[PDB]
């Protein structure tokens with residue numbers, strides 16, 4: 001849809017603080033902090049796939065909207081994730097150990113904008129088409 005494509009990270013605000021709030025250790029925060037990943041979003045039938053590709057770490061999820069799935073995150077959390085579409089925004093929640101974090105992906109002008117919340121920390125990451 002509006003999301004399908006190959007997206008390159010161009011700006012990031014508060015990602016270190018977001019990772020720290022998640023409990024991510026120094027080494028993984030070091031990898032994450034200056035990484036400029038590609039995000040590759042595709043759809044086939046009911047199934048959306050999101051690939052996150054970067055020099056030191058790649059991840060991938062495939063899911064059906066509204067159907068919970070197990071995910072191993074880039075920081076090695078074992079979480080239960082659910083993704084839905086709410087007013088054109090792809091809203092992902094990850095739940096683990098009584099905690100949750102939300103990752104919202106929206107299209108704004110030429111941008112894929114990703115808002116990441118953990119407790120009182122809000123990170124915003126902006127991608128543009130490769």
Ligand SMILES: Cc1noc(-c2c(NC(=O)[C@H]3CCCC[C@H]3C(=O)O)sc3c2CCCC3)n1
Pocket residue numbers: 019022024028031032033035037039052054056057073074075103114116125
């Ligand atoms: C947590 C966590 N811990 O590490 C990483 C991580 C990435 N997280 C995201 O990009 C996602 C998922 C988190 C919100 C931003 C998202 C997005 O913008 O799509 S990219 C990357 C790393 C660590 C290794 C180097 C490359 N997330």
